[PDB]
Amino acid sequence: GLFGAIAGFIEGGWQGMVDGWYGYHHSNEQGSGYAADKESTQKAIDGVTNKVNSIIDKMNTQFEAVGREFNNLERRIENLNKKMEDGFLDVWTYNAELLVLMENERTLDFHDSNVKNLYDKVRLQLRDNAKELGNGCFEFYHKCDNECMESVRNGTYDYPQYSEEARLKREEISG
């Protein structure tokens, strides 16, 4: 959308992932699978739930009673009340509708932003120890066991621990 990620360089989402919104898909010798990024998923959830609850709680509701209390020789006042009621319905209808449109758009753009920021998190973690396939996937220039990938997800990935091996396979294949 706005950040070009969700329906952009990442063409499609993962039915496979179930435990969260944004996440990782790994494939090594132990096998393949999905794992959701805890932090970003919870932050996105908290922000969205807070949005909905903000849209709900800011409404001031006080007691009102309505209301057809005028006789057939009081129809001008009845019309005045009609103009008031109809005016308020028009206001609340227009504002509710537009609120929903605008805020829905911002929500989708929010998801886009979240995913892009995730891709940049991993990207910034590995750098040249892996190749950017441009599909949203990273091709490791080295061996990465489950602890290593779980350390990519953790944000704890050790780059020096693999800098040289990746260096070797990079100067082997990246040219």
Partner: protein, 322 residues
């Protein structure tokens, strides 16, 4: 070679959503912000039962319209439910003065108590027993409003009535009375003796003089005569003074009243459903958490904002294009 990929959730959701720039965007999860559900019942408002009049108008209920349900001790209510067109209004046809303001006043009442103020048996110089009509039958026999007395000439005179009641109660009370407007001088003479007649009513606040109006009219429920009703709120320790030489519809019962709040009269065919809410609608009660609803305009209570739309869906999840 080994690989890590970033991607996002997807599902079977067919849930659509609109956006300022895009329509029918299928999405992971969504929440409707518009409330559309009611319980289809009339309920208490905050643990205070409503006053439910069945086939009676407020007038018919206050006055003792004999065709209306027998009177119930109901000391307290939050709002009044009338049907769109109650069958039983005024058994004897006529009018009610400042009726809408009285209905509004009575819409919400903190204490209400019917009280005998002038016994029917104390009009020794007048007929208090013939003031009866076939349009107002009680137990199959012709009668009249039950809280009010239609006085007739005794033997062949109508002596000048001078009567007063002092509100010795500790609460305000609503007092009701009336005039009869006959059709002709013959009927006038026949009912009262006196041809030119009046009813004056006095209070620390009220200074009234009613004169009946003789006029030829159409028959309503077979009658061309009319009954016109009036009311006041008598303060504690204040008195009310009636004087009349004829056409006096005198009080018998009045009502202790305490007012602390206001509501309105609700028009509904529904019936009570042993229930509590903060928002009542003529189609049913609402358990109201949502900020908007589309049920009905004519509500009483702390309700969502009435809105003209069939759906207000907020996207919470993300785009889902399988």
């Amino acid at each position: 070679q080994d690989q890590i990929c970033i991607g996002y959730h997807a599902n079977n959701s067919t849930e659509q959503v609109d956006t300022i720039m895009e329509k029918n965007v299928t999405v992971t999860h969504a929440q409707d912000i518009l409330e559309k559900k009611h319980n289809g019942k009339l309920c208490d408002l905050d643990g205070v039962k409503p006053l439910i009049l069945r086939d009676c108008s407020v007038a018919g209920w206050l006055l003792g319209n004999p065709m209306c349900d027998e009177f119930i001790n109901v000391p307290e209510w939050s709002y009044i439910v009338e049907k769109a067109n109650p069958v039983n209004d005024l058994c004897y046809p006529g009018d009610f003065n400042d009726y809408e303001e009285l209905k509004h006043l009575l819409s919400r009442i903190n204490h209400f108590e019917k009280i005998q103020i002038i016994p029917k048996s104390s009009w020794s110089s007048h007929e208090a027993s013939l003031g009866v009509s076939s349009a107002c039958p009680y137990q199959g026999k012709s009668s009249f409003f039950r809280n009010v007395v239609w006085l007739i000439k005794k033997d062949s005179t109508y002596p000048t009535i001078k009567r007063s009641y002092n509100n010795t109660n500790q609460e305000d009370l609503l007092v009701l009375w009336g005039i009869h407007h006959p059709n002709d001088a013959a009927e006038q003479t026949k009912l009262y003796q006196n041809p030119t007649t009046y009813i004056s009513v006095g209070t620390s606040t009220l200074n009234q003089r009613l004169v009946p109006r003789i006029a030829t009219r159409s028959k309503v429920k077979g009658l061309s005569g009319r009954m016109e009703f009036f009311w006041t709120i008598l303060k504690p320790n204040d008195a009310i003074n009636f004087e009349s030489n004829g056409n006096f519809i005198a009080p018998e019962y009045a009502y202790k009243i305490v007012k602390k709040g206001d509501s309105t009269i609700m028009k509904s065919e529904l019936e009570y459903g042993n229930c509590n809410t903060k928002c009542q609608t003529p189609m049913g009660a609402i358990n109201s958490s949502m900020p908007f609803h589309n049920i009905h305009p004519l509500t009483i209570g702390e309700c969502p904002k009435y809105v003209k739309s069939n759906r207000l869906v907020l996207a919470i999840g993300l785009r889902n294009s399988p």
